[PDB]
């Protein structure tokens, strides 16, 4: 009775220690959810710096092990599988700045997606990062095409200095709550190290908030 049971118990205990070690490694990694109507924009962010369902992109920046998930390759009902990413540290939202005049209305579709994920019950305390893609092409495109093509209530000079701020302000005003979630909007640049530097800085702030809640100082 105690002969074969001891071997089974020892086997269970031995693998359980491996699970704890693997669990520590999994908790060590920081998770970043990605999505958005800009399926072309997200490719530039991933390929900007060095490192089928969904694609997992693993890399390390300044002694921090990042994990990057490509979800835009998934075409299904969002609410049926978005609860799996409830424990992600910070969502990264990539939207093209020049998609305001595309019909596919493309900016409006991203606006609905941004609103639909900010009101999700699974991301109540999950702050989301914002990336504005094709900034270099955006400043050239606004000269010929006014920004008010899809915005019914835009009244301002068509210059990149204030046009980008209006887009950032519009996205940041789509949140039903402004205390649990903090949106870190960034301007994408040709520099490879600057694109990922903002992610590390944004993740650092999110880690601080999680630590404060875990420690109770929140």
């Amino acid at each position: 009775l105690s002969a074969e049971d001891k071997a089974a118990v020892e086997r269970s205990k031995m693998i359980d220690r491996n699970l704890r070690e693997d669990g520590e490694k999994a908790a060590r990694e920081v998770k970043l959810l990605l999505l958005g109507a800009g399926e072309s924009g997200k490719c530039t962010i991933v390929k900007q710096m060095k490192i089928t369902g969904i694609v997992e992109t693993h890399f390390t920046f300044k002694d921090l092990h990042f994990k990057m998930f490509d979800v835009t390759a998934q075409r299904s009902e969002r609410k049926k599988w978005i609860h799996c990413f409830e424990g992600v540290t910070a969502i990264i939202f990539c939207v093209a700045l020049s998609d305001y005049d595309l019909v596919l209305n493309r900016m409006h579709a991203s606006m609905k997606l941004f609103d639909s994920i900010c009101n999700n019950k699974w991301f109540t305390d999950t702050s989301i990062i914002l990336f504005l893609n094709k900034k270099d092409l955006f400043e050239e495109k606004i000269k010929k095409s006014p920004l008010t093509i899809c915005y019914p209530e835009y009244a301002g000079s068509n210059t990149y200095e204030e046009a980008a701020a209006y887009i950032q302000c519009q996205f940041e005003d789509l949140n039903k709550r402004k205390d649990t979630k903090e949106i870190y909007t960034h301007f994408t640049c040709s520099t490879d190290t600057k694109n990922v530097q903002f992610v590390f800085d944004a993740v650092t702030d999110v880690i601080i908030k999680n630590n404060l809640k875990d420690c109770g100082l929140f």
């Binding site: 704890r20 920081v30 002694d63 921090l64 420690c215 109770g216 100082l217």
Partner: protein
């Protein structure tokens, strides 16, 4: 012209309320952390602090019976040994665990990378052993000589004999004074210069980083840290300074007079013991998740 009776009544009330609320809160915290909540770094740290304070609160009635009897100790010598070592271990563990929690918060705020990578359950278990071993090593002199010597009048009191054999009363007094003053210096240093300063530095760094970076959307993170730091200071600093003053004049104190210094030591000890019971009310019960889980379990 003498307020000694009112002071004694206040001390008795403080001890009674400390015992009851500390026992209740520590039992609830231990139950919730051990069984209702999964083990995390802060969870096991709070569990260890609750154990350290709960053992002291359970042993507190053994100080109540001594205080009611004054000098007389109506219990056995071995029981006095066990109580006077377990209380010292509990107090040292509580102080060192407060310092460790402050350092953990400081390293979580200042270095998010380190707390994300290395700070885990296994590392927390490894680091927890440190304060306990340090407390045991520092208390080892208490275990060595805390024998309950008798009295000529008939009252037997638990006190540091400092000499297994009494060659001469004057020599015994001199040796006791030397041992008491060196122990007092060591206690004051290791219990106020390192722990209190580390706690203050950690909370100051947390406040500066949360203010120079705009990471606080409310005053709660600052208010909680300020409240716990103020409580720890008000509970321990007067006791430490009174103990240091007694250590300076220990040669005159051991002669028999300076009863005012003794009553000041007693009231400061009561104030410090109040910390062991107010610790769960701020370090644990202040958390919204802790309160919600406690309500759900009950």
């Amino acid at each position: 012209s003498a307020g000694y009776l009112f002071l004694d009544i206040i001390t008795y009330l403080v001890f009674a309320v400390t015992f009851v609320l500390g026992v209740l809160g520590n039992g609830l915290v231990i139950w919730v952390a051990g069984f209702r909540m999964t083990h995390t770094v802060t969870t096991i740290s709070y569990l260890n602090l609750a154990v350290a304070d709960f053992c002291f609160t359970s042993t507190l009635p053994f100080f109540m019976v001594r205080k009611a009897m004054g000098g007389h100790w109506p219990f056995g010598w071995f029981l006095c040994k066990f109580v006077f070592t377990i209380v010292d271990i509990n107090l040292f563990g509580s102080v060192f665990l407060i310092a460790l929690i402050a350092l953990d918060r400081c390293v979580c705020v200042l270095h998010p990378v380190w707390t994300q990578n290395h700070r885990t359950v296994s590392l927390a278990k490894k680091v927890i052993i440190g304060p306990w071993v340090m407390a045991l090593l520092l208390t080892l002199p208490v275990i060595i000589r805390v024998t309950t010597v008798p009295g000529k009048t008939g009252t037997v009191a638990c006190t540091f004999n400092f000499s297994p054999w009494t060659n001469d009363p004057k020599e015994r007094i001199n040796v006791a004074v030397a041992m008491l003053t060196v122990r007092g210096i060591i206690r004051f240093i290791i219990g106020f210069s390192a722990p209190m300063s580390i706690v203050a530095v950690s909370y100051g760094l947390i406040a500066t980083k949360i203010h120079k970076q705009g990471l606080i959307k409310s005053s709660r993170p600052l208010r909680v840290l300020s409240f716990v730091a103020a409580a720890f200071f008000l509970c321990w600093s007067p006791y430490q300074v009174v103990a240091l003053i007694a250590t300076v004049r220990i040669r005159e104190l051991l002669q028999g007079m300076y009863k005012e210094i003794g009553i000041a030591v007693d009231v400061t000890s009561a104030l410090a013991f109040f910390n062991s019971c107010l610790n769960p009310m701020l370090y644990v019960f202040m958390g919204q998740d802790f309160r919600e889980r406690l309500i759900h379990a009950l």
